[PDB]
């Protein structure tokens, strides 16, 4: 029942933590970069994924548990202008997280509306995970996360997306967000 079904292409990347960052390289002029944030206003883990859109590997990861929401923003603020002042890619649906519009940092919509949306996403970075396209800091909470994460099925007889044990998802997702800017030998379109 394990959604990332490719988890064994999954490559690991070394990584200094410096900070509250898992950095695996610094950034590069040369390449764009692009950052999949989950974070909100009440939530118990905020995650930044760096990815760098032309090696395809997440160089810089930034997980925090209970931050204000002025240290997730200006965290974030400081991340995105350290890579070349990279778009971030916020699930921001269109009122609240324009808090980036404020402190001008560039940013991609979007909107997780609908259960699919979320399916889709996700299920295009277990694609690109099975193809040997994702390569993330050898972090253990990261692998535990995706391990984690299941289909379960319904009453009716479909299946549901769910991170239960621990419970979170926010890395998954994070994820998710940047790989969808990702061009290997497709875009991702949905």
Known sequence: NSVFSGLDMLILLPYERRGTR???EDYRPDHIYCI???FGK?????????LD??????VCLERMNGATWSDQVARLKALSEDYGH????ADTWDAIAEELDAQGINYTPL???SSSVKEQLISNLALLMEKGQVA?????TILDELRNFRYYRTASGNQVMRAYGRGHDDIVM???LAYSQYEGKDGYKF
């Open 86 to 89: 990279a778009y971030v890619v």
């Open 36 to 38: 999949g944030a989950d």
């Open 42 to 50: 009440n939530q118990d883990y905020s995650v930044f994924s760096v």
């Open 136 to 140: 993330v800091p050898n972090d253990k």
């Open 53 to 58: 859109l032309d090696t395809g590997a997440i």
């Open 174 to 176: 994070s994820l998710a």
């Open 111 to 113: 909107p997780v509306k």
């Open 22 to 24: 898992l950095v695996v």
